[PDB]
Structures are given as C-alpha cells and as structure tokens.
Amino acid sequence: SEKLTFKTDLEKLEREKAAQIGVAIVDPQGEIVAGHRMAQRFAMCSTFKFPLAALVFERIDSGTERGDRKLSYGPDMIVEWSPATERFLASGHMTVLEAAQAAVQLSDNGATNLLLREIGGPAAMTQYFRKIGDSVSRLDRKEPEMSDNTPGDLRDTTTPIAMARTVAKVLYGGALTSTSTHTIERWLIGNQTGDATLRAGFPKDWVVGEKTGTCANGGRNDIGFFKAQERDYAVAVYTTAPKLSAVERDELVASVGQVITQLILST
Numbered sequence: 001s002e003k004l005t006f007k008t009d010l011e012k013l014e015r016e017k018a019a020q021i022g023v024a025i026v027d028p029q030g031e032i033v034a035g036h037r038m039a040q041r042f043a044m045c046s047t048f049k050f051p052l053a054a055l056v057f058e059r060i061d062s063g064t065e066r067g068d069r070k071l072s073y074g075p076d077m078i079v080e081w082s083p084a085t086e087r088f089l090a091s092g093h094m095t096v097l098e099a100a101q102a103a104v105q106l107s108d109n110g111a112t113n114l115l116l117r118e119i120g121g122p123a124a125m126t127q128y129f130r131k132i133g134d135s136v137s138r139l140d141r142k143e144p145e146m147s148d149n150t151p152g153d154l155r156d157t158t159t160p161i162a163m164a165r166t167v168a169k170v171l172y173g174g175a176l177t178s179t180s181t182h183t184i185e186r187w188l189i190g191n192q193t194g195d196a197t198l199r200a201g202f203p204k205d206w207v208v209g210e211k212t213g214t215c216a217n218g219g220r221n222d223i224g225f226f227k228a229q230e231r232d233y234a235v236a237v238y239t240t241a242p243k244l245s246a247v248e249r250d251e252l253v254a255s256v257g258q259v260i261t262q263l264i265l266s267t
C-alpha cells in the first residue's frame with residue numbers, strides 16, 4: 001500500500017510537471033526496495049562522475065595510479081563548467097585527486113575530461129561498469145557533449161535500477177578498499193552541487209551523499225546513498241522535464257526525495 005502511494009505520488013508529479021521520473025532504491029546487496037520506471041534509459045549526465053572517481057580510486061588502490069600524479073594540460077581542456085580546471089590552468093596541471101574531487105564535488109567538466117584522458121576515454125569508463133557487474137550503463141562521449149540528452153539517443157545512458165545497483169556495489173559491495181570506500185562516501189556527503197535536490201527532500205538526520213547531473217533537454221538527476229534509521233540504501237533518480245525552469249527541476253527532484261522518504265518511513 002505504501003508502494004501504491006509511492007507510485008501514485010510520483011505519477012502525480014509526472015503529470016503535473018510534464019516530467020518523466022525514473023527511480024530505484026536498493027539495499028546494500030542490490031535488492032529492490034522501490035522503483036518507478038526503473039528500467040527506462042535516461043542520460044547519465046554528470047552522475048557518471050561518481051563511478052569515474054570510483055574507477056580512479058580502484059586504480060590507486062591497485063597501485064596502477066597515484067593520487068598525487070600531476071596531469072598536464074592547456075587551455076584546450078577548458079570546456080563549459082570547468083571552475084577548478086580554470087583555476088589550476090596557469091599552474092599547468094591538476095593532480096589525479098584534485099581532478100577527481102573537482103569532478104565529484106563541483107561537477108567540473110574539464111577535470112572529468114582530464115581523468116577520461118588518463119584512463120583511455122569513454123570505452124574505459126564503460127569497461128569499468130561492466131567489470132563491476134553493470135551491463136547497462138555506457139559512456140560514449142566526453143563532457144559536455146555526453147550531456148546532450150537528445151531524445152531517443154542511447155549513448156551515455158543508464159537506467160535507475162542499473163545505476164542504483166552500481167552505487168550499492170561501489171559503497172557496500174566491496175568494489176573499493178575500506179579506506180577508498182570511506183573517502184568516496186565522504187566526498188559524496190561534501191558534494192557542493194546537491195543542496196537543492198534529493199537532500200532538500202530528505203530528513204535532516206539521514207546521512208546522505210550524492211552526485212547530481214544536469215543535461216540539455218531538461219534532464220536533472222541525482223544518485224547516491226542514504227543512511228536512515230540504521231539501514232543503508234542506494235538510490236538513483238533520473239528526471240526529464242523540458243518545460244520546467246532550472247529551479248523547478250531542482251524542486252521536482254527534492255519532491256521525489258520527499259516521496260522516497262514517505263516510502264522509507266512506512267517500512
């Protein structure tokens with residue numbers, strides 16, 4: 001019955017906001033807690049930056065990368081929304097960890113593209129999804145074109161259920177060392193771009209960390225984890241709402257946060 005409320009309340013938002021909403025919540029093992037259009041494909045947008053940081057941390061864990069390695073670049077690497085990358089441009093480099101932190105916490109596009117260059121590009125990000133058991137998520141392009149979200153285009157897509165299970169595998173499923181898992185959790189909680197999204201719809205004692213995405217054509221997404229009353233959850237929310245303003249798209253994702261919260265409190 002709380003499941004029907006969840007479904008009805010999301011359908012109400014979809015209808016009233018002219019939006020498509022895809023949600024999946026899974027427990028630490030990836031078992032479904034709730035879902036809504038959970039297997040519809042949505043553009044990842046900047047949400048992939050969290051799995052990208054996980055890939056980088058695993059390479060550091062494995063001794064094939066080091067967090068202090070300096071990555072050289074020029075003005076050619078500055079694309080739209082590259083605030084850290086632009087600050088570090090005169091110095092000529094960012095370290096692997098500086099780039100990862102800017103990618104995760106500021107959504108910096110140039111820092112993300114720097115890491116894609118070092119790992120061998122989109123194909124390598126896709127191979128990491130496959131390695132961790134995700135047969136759906138795919139990165140095809142670098143930023144910002146991967147955020148085009150052209151209707152019908154399956155490049156650069158995931159599904160809510162695949163990405164929620166990828167989050168659960170990274171945080172609870174032993175993809176990373178204990179150290180690296182704790183760090184990436186800490187980075188997600190300290191994300192600077194999510195204050196108006198899912199977090200704005202959750203209780204203030206839940207421990208939440210997330211990565212936002214914004215795409216052209218009205219996409220607004222948020223994926224991450226929350227700890228609610230001694231239970232851990234992974235969540236992925238993908239929305240498309242081309243007729244909403246940017247503020248209204250944040251509000252929609254906060255409202256999906258509140259519908260999630262009502263389901264969780266019911267169980």
Ligand SMILES: *[B]([O])([O])C1=[C]C2=C([C]=[C]C([C][N])=[C]2)S1
Pocket residue numbers: 044045046047080081107109143144146147212213214215
């Ligand atoms: B992320 O993939 O969600 C983003 C892509 C862009 C962001 C900000 C600005 C631009 C402009 N090209 C793209 S966030």
